[PDB]
């Protein structure tokens, strides 16, 4: 669960820094809207308040960088997902740098849970361009998951 893409997250942290009271990096619901505006968006104190009213139970009342991503992803509705997927595979890439196990891979399909039931993912994993024992070019699986 790395939320948006590392890049968008990089520029986000920057904003999260421009606004940092605890000196650590977190911010207060009050500066929230101010941070969202700095990122490059233009939310409304209304919806912005709708999210705060929720995270207003952390105990301290302040929001941390991660929690801020969550509320930030709800407005942007994540990306093309191609990111959460690519990483889903790296979670196993043991130096292979280009291939992952087919078994574990099947597990990745369980985490995402798109629209390819085991039967669909099976017919695929069955011939995902394999050749060795059970390796799979996750890279090809990342795009081949969308195809036409």
What DSSP designation does 144 have?
T
CATH class for the domain made up of 1-148: mainly alpha
**DSSP 3-state assignment of 62?**
strand
Token pair 């996750």 in the structure block, residue: 138
Write down the experimental method used for this entry: NMR
**68, 31 Cβ separation under 8 angstroms:** no
Torsional class of 78: left (φ above 0), alpha (ψ -120 to 50), beta (otherwise): left
- Select from 134, 122, 131, 140 the least CA-distant residue to 85: 140
Torsional class of 67: left (φ above 0), alpha (ψ -120 to 50), beta (otherwise): alpha
**55, 67 Cβ separation under 8 angstroms:** yes
């Amino acid at each position: 669960a790395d939320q948006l893409t590392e890049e968008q997250i990089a520029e986000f942290k920057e904003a999260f820094s421009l606004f940092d009271k605890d000196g650590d990096g977190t911010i207060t619901t009050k500066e929230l809207g101010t941070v969202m505006r700095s990122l490059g968006q233009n939310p409304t104190e209304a919806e912005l308040q709708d999210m705060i009213n929720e995270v207003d139970a952390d105990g301290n009342g302040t929001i941390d960088f991660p929690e801020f991503l969550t509320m930030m992803a709800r407005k942007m509705k994540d990306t093309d997902s191609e990111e959460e997927i690519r990483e889903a595979f790296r979670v196993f890439d043991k130096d292979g740098n280009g291939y992952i196990s087919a078994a574990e891979l099947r597990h990745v399909m369980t985490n995402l849970g798109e629209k390819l039931t085991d039967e669909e993912v099976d017919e695929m994993i069955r011939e995902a361009n394999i050749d060795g024992d059970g390796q799979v070019n996750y890279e090809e699986f990342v795009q081949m998951m969308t195809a036409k």
